Write a protein that binds this ligand. Structure first.
Ligand SMILES: CCCCCCCCCCCCCCCCCC(=O)OC[C@H](COP(=O)([O-])OCC(O)COP(=O)([O-])OC[C@@H](COC(=O)CCCCCCCCCCCCCCCCC)OC(=O)CCCCCCCCCCCCCCCCC)OC(=O)CCCCCCCCCCCCCCCCC
Ligand SMILES: CCCCCCCCCCCCCCCCCC(=O)OC[C@H](COP(=O)([O-])OCC(O)COP(=O)([O-])OC[C@@H](COC(=O)CCCCCCCCCCCCCCCCC)OC(=O)CCCCCCCCCCCCCCCCC)OC(=O)CCCCCCCCCCCCCCCCC
Ligand SMILES: COC1=C(OC)C(=O)C(C/C=C(\C)CC/C=C(\C)CC/C=C(\C)CC/C=C(\C)CC/C=C(/C)CC/C=C(\C)CC/C=C(\C)CC/C=C(\C)CC/C=C(\C)CCC=C(C)C)=C(C)C1=O
Ligand SMILES: CCCCCCCCCCCCCCCCCC(=O)OC[C@H](COP(=O)([O-])OCC[N+](C)(C)C)OC(=O)CCCCCCCCCCCCCCCCC
Ligand SMILES: CCCCCCCCCCCCCCCCCC(=O)OC[C@H](COP(=O)([O-])OCC[N+](C)(C)C)OC(=O)CCCCCCCCCCCCCCCCC
Ligand SMILES: CCCCCCCCCCCCCCCCCC(=O)OC[C@H](COP(=O)([O-])OCC[N+](C)(C)C)OC(=O)CCCCCCCCCCCCCCCCC
Ligand SMILES: CCCCCCCCCCCCCCCCCC(=O)OC[C@H](COP(=O)(O)OCCN)OC(=O)CCCCCCCCCCCCCCCCC
Ligand SMILES: CCCCCCCCCCCCCCCCCC(=O)OC[C@H](COP(=O)(O)OCCN)OC(=O)CCCCCCCCCCCCCCCCC
Ligand SMILES: CCCCCCCCCCCCCCCCCC(=O)OC[C@H](COP(=O)(O)OCCN)OC(=O)CCCCCCCCCCCCCCCCC
Ligand SMILES: CCCCCCCCCC(=O)OC[C@H](COP(=O)(O)OCCC(C)C)OC(=O)CCCCCCC
Ligand SMILES: CCCCCCCCCCCC
Ligand SMILES: CCCCCCCCCCCC
Lengths: 52, 52, 52, 117, 208, 174, 315
């Protein structure tokens, strides 16, 4: 029932692989790029700061 | 609104572009950056009346 | 002026009404030319900006 | 090709002399703390531009690489028409362009030429 | 002092600030040679007491407002004394230019005949200010040791407080930091240790 | 003389390429490597076709690889080392000296150029890339070209299958 | 090889480089004058006599203003990229078909494609090394632009080559002795004009240097010489594709002044498209150069394959 037949010192800290062969990837948090259309931008009409 | 004196007690200016820039968050979402630039123009919004 | 005239319960004459209407639509053309030129610069058309 | 090497080195030399002459004759003012900062439309950046960038056209780039090495096999047959069997040349050329049209129209049908989104 | 009989003479040491010559001289490319730092006697035998520029300016303000400061000489030094090797090592620790990653090393300038010829060429071929403030007068200005005279009042007599380098120079060497392109996290770069300050007995043991 | 110079430059850029941790240093090093390799390959053939083809190939490939640099390992520190600069400079000046003091007839390539071929060769008087590229479209090996068209179509099908476009864009920590 | 050749090749190449650089300056003057006259307003008129030394005003100022030493940038890669941009934009001009033997470019189309691919490499290196978000966005827009137009530019070139039978552009002169190729290749006169604006990063495809979508594109951190060499590199690319429109579609003769009048006219067309049409999105550029231009190029390549087999049997 171990990960291997004969657990060594390094090997015995492992866990059993899942009986289902499929391991779904986890959903990790993503930090997107913070770009501001600041005031100097001509599309921002002079005094608008869009923190996109 | 006036208290009967020579000066107005309080004058509030309803910006036409205030609600447009408020709904910019939903209108401009899931679009391109160039699509955001055109949308900002489509709402007409000089920020003197918005900022008051 | 309509706010202060509604508070003062006074009425404007017909000539002042037509002057206000005429210059309000002249003012409308000016805002739209501003909107068309601003949207043309934001989209990329350099020419109708100057042409209007 | 040996002359092209020498004239490419001369153009590189002339452009480096032009850039060094632009640097020497430039106005030498003292460097301010916030002069050197990245622009970011007049405000603080909140993030470096070395932050990872999202790629929505990865399939289009690899299809571009595949189509470019497909370009590398079309360029011979300008010369090969006058010196080969006409039947074999036409079977290869029309079959090449029709296979490219099948592949491009099939990926247009699947919508794989649209950006991921 | 002969011509104007009551003049508030202020004697400053090397002055550190923004747009200065002291930090900008060490931070410049033309002073170092192939990512190595040449210093006189490896910086060990030169002891300096630098002063911050707003301290000197506020001393000038307090000397202008006080009429009792006329006809006096005021020493303008910082609160603590350092030697030049510890100062340069602390500057390159603040600049994220360590021994291993950047290749910064300190060697004696007296065995280097290239650097003096480079300084003379930089003073000769420049029509205006030399590049990086590199000239033999700057070499003699950094070579001399900052010595105060007893009985001559310091800036504490003028009522101004003194700014330690540990309050300003970590901010002041922020644009001169190496590898500013790297989007570092909080624990990526360790805050360097403050430099050691030389005492009186260590200074008399060093100068003996 | 130019061939030995290209030998020395390729050796020095290969030493530089073996020592660079950062992907953009590898990209610029293999840019100058494919420039020098394209010139050297040209020296061997009568015509200059395959150098041009290899340059379009290796500029169409790393154009994509920079987008993957900016999407994955965009933030990584450059580390200049004085030892590598001194080693590359000393080896480069040593090989230019060794190439200058060398007999260039012995070090030249034995592969025949367009002018190294004799006058009696009537096949040399044709258009310069005709008989070299002929067998792509001739009868014995057109079927290999057919196999390459089908192989590129199967390659594109594989790329579409294992890059699922509907799973979203790719970045670090997606 | 005779010694005098090398000397005259060097002299002609250097004279060509100098004349292309001064023609870049007067091309900026031509764009600033007719592009004003695209609208109602005038061009530069006050400075000098009638605005003729105005590029000299623009060149004296940019060679004297303070060089930017940016903070977060890689300066050792930021300083070198406009030099290489101008180097390839002047190095591509050695491909010009001279009736004298300037250079015996038997593979001029492949040389043009190599320098075309390398110029956008200098653009995308200059975009990354500025360490600004708008500069990286302009650089990635330039990479998406060249990935859009590269295979379309190659296949369209092959169709013209088929009408020639060789890769030497002086053979364009012998096949255009009776008429120009604008009669046959009018849909790719439109398509090659579309590609040549995407090659030179010009309006309607101006995503690498955007003034409204981005702030100056990848030129946001470049000033006083870096911007100057980037700008001359772009305008020398404009002059080169105006020349290539005159070579392929019009008469390839170079001993007539009508050729250079036509080159000035195609440069005026390059200014004229910028002053009329709005900019695209590069989403629509990628959907255009992959589904319309590439399909039309493959289809009309099939048409030219069949026409060249039909013509070869008749000869
Ligand atoms: C070499 C590689 C390293 C260069 C380097 O790190 O330079 C830093 C240096 C940074 O400038 P800085 O020291 O902060 O500013 C003070 C000025 O150097 C000095 O300010 P300035 O305005 O008084 O100086 C006048 C300015 C302008 O001079 C002129 O207009 C005279 C032109 C003749 O000339 C210079 O700055 C350079 C003068 C020496 C080179 C030109 C003379 C000819 C010999 C070399 C060829 O960069 C340059 O000076 C760039 C130009 C290259 C100079 C060599
Ligand atoms: C059998 C035959 C084959 C045998 C092969 C054996 C040799 C290879 C074994 C390698 C083993 C290994 O893993 O080694 C790693 C080991 C560790 O590498 P590392 O250097 O510590 O780390 C490198 C970084 O990781 C690098 O990280 P990174 O990527 O962040 O670095 C950025 C990278 C970025 O690099 C680049 O971007 C590449 C740039 C290349 C072109 C540069 C052109 C410059 C033109 C001017 O910069 C560099 O790599 C520096 C390049 C500097 C420019 C070099 C200019 C010369 C070469 C030019 C080539 C041709 C191009 C010409 C231009 C063409 C234009 C179209 O390498 C070494 O230890 C190197 C060997 C050193 C031996 C001793 C050298 C002599 C003694 C020096 C001290 C002398 C003291 C004297 C004292 C006197 C007073 C007492
Ligand atoms: C409604 O809400 C809004 C607001 O609120 C009210 C706002 O406020 C705003 C903000 C708006 C404003 C404040 C004003 C509105 C803005 C505009 C109207 C801008 C739009 C107009 C333009 C962009 C101009 C039109 C474009 C033109 C004319 C194109 C050309 C422009 C240039 C800049 C090109 C000039 C650059 C040059 C020439 C570079 C110089 C380089 C050279 C000359 C190099 C050449 C060298 C040579 C010739 C010689 C060299 C030779 C050499 C080296 C070798 C010689 C050697 C020898 C030996 C001889 C907005 C948008 C808004 O919506
Ligand atoms: C093709 C056209 C390319 C045009 C640009 C060429 C740039 C040349 C840079 C040469 C740098 C040499 C060097 O020592 O670099 C070490 C330096 C080390 O950085 P540093 O900041 O430590 O160096 C400063 C050195 N001192 C202190 C002495 C002044 O690294 C760089 O300069 C960065 C190189 C970036 C290379 C980007 C390549 C992009 C390739 C894109 C396509 C492939 C994917
Ligand atoms: C193609 C052109 C390439 C560039 C040529 C050089 C720059 C342009 C010419 C010089 C500047 C304009 C002329 C000028 O300022 O003249 C005023 C000055 C004289 O004016 P002034 O400064 O003595 O007096 C002011 C003028 N009044 C008297 C009316 C108040 O002209 C000269 O000094 C002559 C210079 C040489 C002119 C040679 C002929 C030019 C003909 C037209 C060519 C186009
Ligand atoms: C078509 C391409 C043309 C390319 C060249 C375009 C310009 C050519 C004509 C103008 C030349 C200007 C040269 C000097 C430029 C720098 C001016 C400057 O600030 O100098 C201050 C410097 C230093 O004087 P300073 O004491 O005022 O500087 C202290 C520092 N600042 C600037 C902050 C006050 O002056 C010089 O270096 C004098 C140089 C004289 C000789 C110049 C070259 C002549 C030959 C060309
Ligand atoms: C040897 C290599 C490996 C093997 C070959 C791999 C590639 C095979 C490509 C062809 C596959 C054909 C069999 C699968 C057909 C699937 C359905 C399909 O594509 O139908 C055709 C479709 C119909 O048109 P549609 O876009 O649906 O219009 C709406 C009308 N109501 O759409 C069309 O008519 C347009 C696209 C048709 C397909 C491309 C052009 C031929
Ligand atoms: C490098 C470029 C060199 C040639 C251009 C610069 C010299 C000519 C010039 O423009 O001189 C300035 C002056 C004219 O002054 P400006 O303000 O341009 O005129 C406005 C009225 N149209 O013109 C004059 O003062 C004329 C006298 C000098 C002309 C010198 C021309 C050769 C230099
Ligand atoms: C295909 C890919 C190929 C890739 C490989 C290409 C390799 C090319 C060769 C590379 C050589 C690199 C040498 C680098 C030396 C300078 C290093 C450096 O970084 O210098 C910094 C200096 C100022 O920059 P700094 O203050 O550090 O600001 C950055 C802060 N973030 O920066 C500067 O001062 C800017 C540089 C100025 C240089 C001036 C040189 C002196 C003048 C020379 C003579 C000019 C003569 C002109 C007139 C001639 C007339 C005939
Ligand atoms: C700094 C180099 C920038 C990159 C240049 C790329 C050129 C095209 C690629 C190539 O291999 O072209 C083969 C061509 C082969 O020449 P061609 O076949 O074009 O012409 C024959 C040549 C005298 C008949 C026309 O060579 C070059 O373009 C020379 C490049 C010189 C590089 C100098 C620096 C090392
Ligand atoms: C590029 C080589 C620069 C060498 C600079 C001097 C190094 C001296 C080392 C003395 C022993 C630590
Ligand atoms: C440009 C080279 C400078 C070298 C400086 C270090 C010299 C070390 C050896 C000194 C022997 C007296």
């Amino acid at each position: 029932s171990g990960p291997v037949m004969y657990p060594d010192e390094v090997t015995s800290l492992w866990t059993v692989p899942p009986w289902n062969s499929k391991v779904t990837p986890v959903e990790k948090s993503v930090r997107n790029l913070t770009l501001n259309f600041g005031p100097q931008h001509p599309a921002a009409h002079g005094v608008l700061r869009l923190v996109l | 609104i006036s208290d009967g004196s020579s000066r107005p007690y309080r004058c509030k200016i309803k910006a036409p572009g205030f609600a447009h820039l408020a709904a910019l968050e939903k209108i401009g979402k899931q679009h391109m950056l160039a699509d955001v630039v055109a949308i900002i123009g489509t709402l007409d919004v000089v920020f003197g009346e918005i900022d008051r | 002026s309509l706010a202060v005239e509604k508070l003062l319960n006074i009425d404007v004459p017909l000539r002042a009404k037509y002057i206000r209407t005429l210059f309000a639509e002249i003012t409308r053309i000016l805002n739209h030319i501003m909107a068309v030129g601003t949207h043309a610069l934001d989209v990329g058309a350099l020419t109708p900006f100057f042409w209007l | 090709m040996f002359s092209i090497i020498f004239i490419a080195l001369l153009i590189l030399l002339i452009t480096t002399i032009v850039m060094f002459l632009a640097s020497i004759l430039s106005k030498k003012a003292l460097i301010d703390r916030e002069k050197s900062s990245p622009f970011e439309c007049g405000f603080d950046p909140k993030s470096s531009s070395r932050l990872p960038f999202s790629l929505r056209f990865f399939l289009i780039t690899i299809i571009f690489l595949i189509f470019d090495v497909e370009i590398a096999l079309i360029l011979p047959m300008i010369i090969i028409m006058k010196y080969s069997n006409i039947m074999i040349w036409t079977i290869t050329s029309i079959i090449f362009i029709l296979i490219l049209l099948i592949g491009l129209y099939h990926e247009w049908n699947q919508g794989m030429l649209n950006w991921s989104n | 002092r002969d011509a104007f009989p009551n003049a508030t003479i202020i004697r400053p040491a090397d002055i550190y600030g923004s747009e200065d010559r002291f930090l900008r001289y060490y931070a410049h490319i033309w002073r170092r040679q192939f990512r190595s730092m040449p210093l006189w006697h490896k910086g060990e035998k030169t002891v300096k007491q630098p002063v911050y520029v707003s301290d000197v300016a506020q001393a000038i303000i307090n000397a202008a407002k006080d009429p009792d400061s006329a006809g006096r000489i005021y020493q303008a030094v910082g609160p603590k004394r350092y030697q030049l090797s510890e100062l340069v090592d602390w500057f390159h620790r603040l600049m994220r230019k360590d021994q291993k990653r950047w290749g910064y090393m300190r060697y004696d300038m007296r065995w280097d005949p290239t650097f003096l010829l480079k300084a003379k060429l930089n003073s000769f071929i420049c029509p205006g200010t030399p590049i990086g403030g590199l000239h033999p007068a700057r070499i003699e200005r950094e070579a001399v040791t900052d010595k105060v005279l007893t009985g001559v009042p310091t800036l504490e007599d003028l009522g101004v407080t003194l700014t330690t380098m540990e309050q300003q120079v970590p901010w002041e060497l922020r644009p001169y930091r190496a590898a500013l392109y790297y989007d570092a996290e909080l624990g990526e770069f360790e805050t360097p240790s403050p430099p050691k300050c030389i005492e009186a007995r260590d200074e008399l043991r060093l100068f003996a | 003389m130019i061939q030995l110079m290209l030998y020395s430059l390729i050796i020095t850029t290969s030493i530089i390429f073996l020592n660079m941790i950062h992907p953009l240093a590898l990209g610029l090093t293999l840019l100058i490597q494919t420039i020098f390799v394209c010139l050297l390959t040209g020296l061997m053939t009568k015509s200059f076709w395959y150098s041009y083809i290899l340059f379009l190939i290796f500029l169409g490939g790393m154009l994509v690889l920079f987008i993957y640099v900016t999407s994955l390992a965009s933030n990584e520190m450059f580390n200049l080392s004085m030892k590598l600069t001194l080693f590359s400079s000393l080896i480069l000046i040593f090989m230019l000296i060794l190439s200058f003091i060398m007999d260039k007839t012995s070090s030249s390539l034995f592969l025949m150029n367009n002018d190294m071929q004799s006058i009696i060769n009537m096949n040399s008087y044709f258009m310069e890339n005709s008989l070299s590229l002929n067998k792509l479209y001739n009868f014995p090996t057109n079927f290999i070209t057919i196999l390459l068209m089908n192989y590129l179509l199967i390659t594109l099908i594989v790329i579409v299958k294992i890059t699922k476009l509907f799973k979203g864009p790719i970045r670090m920590m997606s | 090889m005779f010694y005098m050749e090398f000397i005259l090749s060097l002299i002609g190449s250097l004279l060509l480089i100098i004349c292309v650089l001064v023609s870049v300056a007067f091309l900026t003057l031509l764009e600033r004058k007719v592009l004003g006259y695209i609208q109602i307003r005038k061009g530069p008129n006050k400075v000098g006599l009638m605005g003729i030394p105005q590029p000299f005003c623009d060149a004296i100022k940019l060679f004297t203003k303070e060089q930017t030493y940016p903070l977060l940038s890689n300066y050792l890669s930021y300083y070198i990229s406009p030099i290489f941009s101008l180097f390839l934009s002047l190095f591509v001009w050695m491909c010009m078909p001279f009736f004298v033997k300037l250079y015996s470019f038997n593979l001029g189309g492949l040389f043009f494609l190599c320098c075309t691919s390398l110029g956008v490499y200098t653009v995308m290196v200059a975009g990354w090394s500025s360490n600004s978000n708008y500069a990286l966005l302009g650089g990635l827009r330039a990479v998406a632009q060249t990935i859009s137009y590269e295979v379309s530019l190659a296949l369209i070139l092959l169709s013209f080559i088929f009408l020639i039978g060789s890769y030497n552009m002086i053979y364009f002169f012998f096949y255009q002795v009776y008429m120009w190729f604008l009669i046959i290749l009018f849909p790719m006169a439109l398509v090659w004009v579309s590609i040549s604006l995407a090659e030179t990063n010009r309006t309607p495809f101006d995503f690498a240097e955007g003034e409204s979508e981005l702030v100056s594109g990848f030129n946001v951190e470049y000033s006083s010489g870096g911007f100057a060499l980037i700008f001359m590199a772009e305008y020398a690319s404009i002059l080169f594709m105006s020349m290539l429109f005159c070579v392929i579609f019009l008469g390839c003769d170079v001993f007539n002044l009508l050729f250079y009048m036509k080159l000035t006219f195609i440069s005026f067309v390059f200014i004229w498209v910028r002053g009329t049409l709005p900019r695209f999105r590069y989403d629509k550029l990628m959907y255009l150069a992959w589904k319309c231009f590439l399909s039309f190029s493959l289809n009309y390549l099939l048409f030219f394959i069949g026409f060249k087999i039909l013509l070869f049997s008749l000869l």
